[PDB]
Short mmCIF file of C-alpha atoms in Angstrom, two decimals:
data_model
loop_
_atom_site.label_atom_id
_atom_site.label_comp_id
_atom_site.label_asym_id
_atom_site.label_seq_id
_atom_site.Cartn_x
_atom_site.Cartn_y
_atom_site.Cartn_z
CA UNK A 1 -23.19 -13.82 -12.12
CA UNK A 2 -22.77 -10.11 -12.48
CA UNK A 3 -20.35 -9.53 -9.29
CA UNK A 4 -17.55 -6.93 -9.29
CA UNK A 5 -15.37 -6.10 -6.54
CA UNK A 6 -14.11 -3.02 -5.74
CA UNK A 7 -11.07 -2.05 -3.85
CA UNK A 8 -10.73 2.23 -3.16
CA UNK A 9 -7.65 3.71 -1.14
CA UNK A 10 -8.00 5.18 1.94
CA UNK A 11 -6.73 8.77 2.35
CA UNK A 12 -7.78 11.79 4.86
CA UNK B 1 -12.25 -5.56 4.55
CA UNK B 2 -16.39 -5.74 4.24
CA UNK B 3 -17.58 -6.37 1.21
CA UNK B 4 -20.87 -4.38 0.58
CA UNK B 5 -23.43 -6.04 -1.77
CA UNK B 6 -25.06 -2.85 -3.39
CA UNK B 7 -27.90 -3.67 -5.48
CA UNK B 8 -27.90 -2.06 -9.18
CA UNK B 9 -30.77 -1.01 -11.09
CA UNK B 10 -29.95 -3.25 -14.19
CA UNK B 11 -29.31 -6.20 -11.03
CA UNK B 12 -25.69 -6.19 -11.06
CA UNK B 13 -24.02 -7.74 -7.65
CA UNK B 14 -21.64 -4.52 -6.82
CA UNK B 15 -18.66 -6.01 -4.16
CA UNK B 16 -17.57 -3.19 -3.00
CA UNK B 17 -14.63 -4.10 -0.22
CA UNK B 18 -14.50 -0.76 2.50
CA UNK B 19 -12.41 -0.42 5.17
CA UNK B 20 -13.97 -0.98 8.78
CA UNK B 21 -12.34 2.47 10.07
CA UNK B 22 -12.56 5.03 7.30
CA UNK B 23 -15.93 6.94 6.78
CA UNK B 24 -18.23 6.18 4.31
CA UNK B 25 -18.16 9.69 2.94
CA UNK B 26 -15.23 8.09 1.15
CA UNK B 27 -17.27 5.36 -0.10
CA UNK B 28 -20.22 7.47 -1.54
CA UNK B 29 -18.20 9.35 -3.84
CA UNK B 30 -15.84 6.87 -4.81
CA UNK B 31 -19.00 4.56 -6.06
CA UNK B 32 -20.47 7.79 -7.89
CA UNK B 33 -16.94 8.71 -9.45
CA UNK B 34 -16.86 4.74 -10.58
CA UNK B 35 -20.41 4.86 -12.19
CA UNK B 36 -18.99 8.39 -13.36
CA UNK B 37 -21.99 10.28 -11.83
CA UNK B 38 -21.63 13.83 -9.44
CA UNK B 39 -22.73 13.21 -5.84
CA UNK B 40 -25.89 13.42 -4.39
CA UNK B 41 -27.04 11.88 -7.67
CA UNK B 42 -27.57 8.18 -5.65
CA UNK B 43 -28.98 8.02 -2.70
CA UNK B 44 -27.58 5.10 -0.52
CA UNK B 45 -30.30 2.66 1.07
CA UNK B 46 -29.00 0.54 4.23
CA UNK B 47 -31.86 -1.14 6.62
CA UNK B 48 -34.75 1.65 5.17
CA UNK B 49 -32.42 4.84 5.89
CA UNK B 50 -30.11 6.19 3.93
CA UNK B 51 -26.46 6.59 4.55
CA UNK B 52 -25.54 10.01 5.40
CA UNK B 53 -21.76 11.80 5.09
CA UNK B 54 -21.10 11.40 8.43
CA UNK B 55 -21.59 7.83 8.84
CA UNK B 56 -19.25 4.86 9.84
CA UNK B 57 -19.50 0.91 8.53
CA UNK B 58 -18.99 0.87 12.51
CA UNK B 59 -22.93 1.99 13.53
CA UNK B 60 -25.88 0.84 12.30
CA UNK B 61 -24.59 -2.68 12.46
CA UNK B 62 -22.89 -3.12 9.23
CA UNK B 63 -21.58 -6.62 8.45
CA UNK B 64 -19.19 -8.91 5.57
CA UNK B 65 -20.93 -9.04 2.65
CA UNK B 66 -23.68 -6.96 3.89
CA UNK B 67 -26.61 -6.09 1.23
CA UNK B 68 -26.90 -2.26 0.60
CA UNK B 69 -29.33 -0.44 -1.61
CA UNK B 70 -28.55 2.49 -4.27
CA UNK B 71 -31.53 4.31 -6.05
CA UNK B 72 -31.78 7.81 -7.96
CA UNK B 73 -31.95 10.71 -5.86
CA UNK B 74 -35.64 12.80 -7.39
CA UNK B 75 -33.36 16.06 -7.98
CA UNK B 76 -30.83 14.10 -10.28
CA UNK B 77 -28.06 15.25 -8.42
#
């Protein structure tokens, strides 16, 4: 398994 | 969220987890600043086209854990 999750923040 | 599968060259299973009302313009850059490559470097693959700066998870007909292609632009960035 090579699976990486990745969370970013939302902003205008 | 939606978790987008993007395929990497060395076959690594990239989650990435977007938000279904923010533009992917966001997304594109974040996932270049994370590989810690400029943008316009990768070109984004989805269904045979390839995402532009103006586009939404909310066209096309983007899905959870939906498969999406990256691949090296010719130009290099």
């Amino acid at each position: 398994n090579n699976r990486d999750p990745i969370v970013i923040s939302d902003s205008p | 969220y939606i978790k987008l599968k993007v395929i990497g060259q060395d076959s690594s299973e990239i989650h990435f987890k977007v938000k279904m009302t923010t533009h992917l313009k966001k997304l594109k850059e974040s996932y270049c600043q994370r590989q810690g490559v400029p943008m316009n470097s990768l070109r984004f693959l989805f269904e045979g086209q390839r995402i532009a700066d103006n586009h939404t998870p909310k066209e096309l007909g983007m899905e959870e854990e939906d498969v999406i292609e990256v691949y090296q632009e010719q130009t290099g960035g």
